[PDB]
Each structure stands twice: as structure tokens, then as C-alpha cells.
């Protein structure tokens, strides 16, 4: 028997501003359904406190997608609209099973391309330095596929305990704070000026696994998004 995330108060504010995509982008449950007790192995309250996401398969997801609050439709904002767009979370990333290679846990996405992904990564070299079992940001600065279109940053090695995140977008600039420490300040987003379809996401989006059955698993102790 699985306990629903909505059975406690902690996540109601974000559930009131999200729909859930599972197991792919086009299959969704509404904010109303989430608030009404949506539950399953993919999305349940673990140990009385964690909004836990689980998903297997290449490019499959169990992921919240930002909505206008209070039964609203899909949100679309812009990096240069003047509003500060802020997402906060506290995440326990447990040990990922063999075959899971990258799990996107927070995003800024849009109708053109992902402006930002925060992901857990098993192993990667960045700017000449090898990192293992760590949290990375990937920012798009163009629409191409080569590495020149991205800025990738080692944010923090994965920790045993909960790790806090804050993503702030204001006036075409991005700041990321992890465990209270700034890890990216003033990253340019101006390529995306005028893109009015941006939105936050969070959960588990399974990227390039080497086994289709390996289940990615991510636990949120807190999640919120706000415009201010």
C-alpha cells in the first residue's frame, strides 16, 4: 500500500502549480488529480516525507511540469520578462542502480529547447577534470547539438543527505545555489530572450541508460516554484 504525496501538506503548493508527466511527456495527470490523491509506484510518499519519483527506460520520465496555479493552464514565461523566476528544492539522490547513467532532476524547458537541466551523472570529464557520481548543470547557449551549444558545470558531488537547490532567473541571467553555496552566478540566457514558453520541471527524467529496465529513483523533501 502506497501513501499519496498529497496526504501531507508539504507538497500541496507545488502540486497546485504542476501536472505530472508519466511515463512520457505526452501522458499526463492534472494538478487537480495530483491534489486529489494521485499515487503509484512511480510517484508516492516515501518514509512519510519524500515525494519520490521512479522511472525506467530511455528518455522516459516521471516529472512535474509547471502550471499556472489554481487549476490554470500551462505556464510560459521568458528569461527577459523582468520577473524573477525561482525554483527551490531539497533532494535526496539515493544510489542509482546499474544501467542508470544520467537523471535529470530539475529543468527550465520551453517550446524550443531546454534552457537548463540539473542532472545526476554517473561519470564525466568536464574541462579536463574527471568527476563521478555528481550533480551537473547543462545550460544551452544555442540550438545546435555540438558541445559548443552547452555550458556544463560540476555543481556538487552526490551527498548522502538532502541537498538543497535554488534556481533563479532574472533579466536574462541564471544563478544556481546548492546547499546554500553559489555554484553558477550570472550565466547568460540572452540567446533565449523573447522565448515566452519557458517553464520549470522537476522529478526524474532518465537520460541515456544502458539498461531499459533499470529504474531511476529520486526523492524530494521539498519543491516549490514562484514568480516574484
Ligand X SMILES: O=C(O)[C@H]1O[C@@H](O[C@H]2[C@H](O)[C@H](O)[C@H](O[C@H]3[C@H](O)[C@H](O)[C@@H](O)O[C@@H]3C(=O)O)O[C@@H]2C(=O)O)[C@@H](O)[C@@H](O)[C@@H]1O
Of 50 and 191, the one with the shorter C-beta distance to Na ion is: 50
What residues contact 65, with CB distance under 8 A and at least 6 apart? 18, 19, 20, 21, 28, 74, 199, 201
Selection from Na ion, ligand X, none that 147 binds (CB < 5 to 8 A by kind) is ligand X
Of 33 and 133, the one with the shorter C-beta distance to ligand X is: 133
Location of C-alpha cell 541515456:
208
Of 147 and 213, the one with the shorter C-beta distance to ligand X is: 147
Selection from Na ion, ligand X, none that 137 binds (CB < 5 to 8 A by kind) is none
Q: Report DSSP letters for 193-227, one per residue.
A: TT---BEEEEEEEE-S-S-SS-EEEEEEEEEEEEE
Selection from Na ion, ligand X, none that 94 binds (CB < 5 to 8 A by kind) is Na ion
Of 76 and 94, the one with the shorter C-beta distance to Na ion is: 94
The rounded distance, in Å, linking the Cα atoms of 162 and 189 is: 28
Contacting residues toward Na ion, per CB under 5 A: 94
Selection from ligand X, Na ion, none that 73 binds (CB < 5 to 8 A by kind) is none
Partnered with residue 218 across adjacent β-strands are 53
Contacting residues toward ligand X, per CB under 6 A: 113-114, 117, 138, 140, 147, 150, 152, 207-208
Selection from ligand X, Na ion, none that 150 binds (CB < 5 to 8 A by kind) is ligand X
Neighbour tally for 88: CB within 10 Å: 18
| Exposed e or buried b per residue across 167-193, where buried means at least 16 C-beta atoms within 10 angstroms of its C-beta | bbbbebbbbbbbeeeebbeebebebbe
Of 95 and 145, the one with the shorter C-beta distance to Na ion is: 95
- Min separation Cβ 55 and ligand X, Å: 14
Selection from ligand X, Na ion, none that 173 binds (CB < 5 to 8 A by kind) is none
| Exposed e or buried b per residue across 30-40, where buried means at least 16 C-beta atoms within 10 angstroms of its C-beta | ebeebbeebbe
Of 73 and 147, the one with the shorter C-beta distance to ligand X is: 147
Ramachandran class of 213: left when φ > 0, alpha when ψ lies in -120 to 50, beta otherwise: alpha
Amino acid at each position: 500500500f502506497l501513501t499519496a504525496v498529497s496526504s501531507i501538506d508539504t507538497f500541496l503548493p507545488v502540486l497546485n502549480e504542476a501536472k505530472l508527466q508519466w511515463p512520457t511527456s505526452a501522458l499526463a495527470a492534472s494538478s487537480e488529480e495530483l491534489l486529489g490523491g494521485y499515487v503509484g509506484s512511480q510517484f508516492y510518499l516515501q518514509d512519510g516525507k519524500y515525494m519520490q519519483f521512479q522511472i525506467a527506460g530511455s528518455s522516459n520520465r516521471c516529472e512535474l511540469r509547471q502550471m499556472i496555479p489554481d487549476g490554470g493552464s500551462e505556464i510560459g514565461w521568458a528569461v527577459d520578462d523582468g520577473t524573477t523566476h525561482t525554483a527551490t528544492s531539497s533532494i535526496v539522490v539515493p544510489e542509482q542502480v546499474d544501467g542508470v547513467e544520467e537523471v535529470t532532476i530539475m529543468q527550465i524547458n520551453s517550446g524550443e529547447a531546454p534552457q537548463l537541466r540539473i542532472s545526476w551523472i554517473r561519470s564525466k570529464s568536464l574541462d579536463g577534470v574527471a568527476y563521478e557520481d555528481f550533480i551537473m548543470s547543462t545550460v544551452r547557449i544555442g540550438t545546435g547539438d555540438s558541445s559548443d551549444n552547452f555550458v556544463k558545470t560540476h555543481l556538487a558531488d552526490r551527498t548522502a543527505g538532502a541537498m538543497s537547490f535554488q534556481i533563479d532567473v532574472k533579466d536574462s541571467k541564471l544563478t544556481i545555489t546548492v546547499n546554500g553555496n553559489v555554484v553558477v552566478n550570472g550565466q547568460d540566457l540572452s540567446f533565449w530572450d523573447g522565448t515566452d514558453s519557458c517553464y520549470f520541471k522537476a522529478g526524474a527524467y532518465n537520460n541515456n541508460p544502458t539498461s531499459e529496465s533499470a529504474t531511476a529513483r529520486i526523492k524530494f523533501a521539498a519543491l516549490a516554484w514562484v514568480d516574484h
